[PDB]
Design a protein around this ligand. Structure first.
Ligand code: NA
Length: 91
DNA sequence: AATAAAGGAAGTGGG
DNA sequence: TCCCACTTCCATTTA
């Protein structure tokens, strides 16, 4: 099953939910969620995973925070903004 | 107040 | 057995 960081990177590459997520500086791997349209993207993540409950942005962001230690995704000090590691971007 | 963004603990999956 | 990679739940802080 796909990992959350890969699901997000793939969306950014495909542009399929451009109103929910976008690159801020793709060279740096920084990206930002839409305040008003992030829930639709969270719903898609839960459906793709086949989870029992409806996924919310809050639960998705709870998972994202767990990457901060290992480094795949880090929170940036800007609203709704995160950053992929160089290793994730390269792979 | 109303709204919104921003981790400890225990449960679930598939090894 | 016991970690993976989250998921779910609940609570708190700041703006
Ligand atoms: Na929020």
């Amino acid at each position: 099953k796909i990992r959350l960081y890969q699901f997000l990177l793939d969306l950014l590459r495909s542009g399929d939910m451009k109103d929910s997520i976008w690159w801020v500086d793709k060279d740096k791997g920084t990206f930002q969620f839409s305040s008003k349209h992030k829930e639709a993207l969270a719903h898609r993540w839960g459906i793709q995973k086949g989870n029992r409950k409806k996924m919310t942005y809050q639960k998705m962001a709870r998972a994202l925070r767990n990457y901060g230690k290992t480094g795949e995704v880090k929170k940036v000090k800007k609203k709704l903004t995160y950053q992929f590691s160089g290793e994730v971007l390269g792979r």
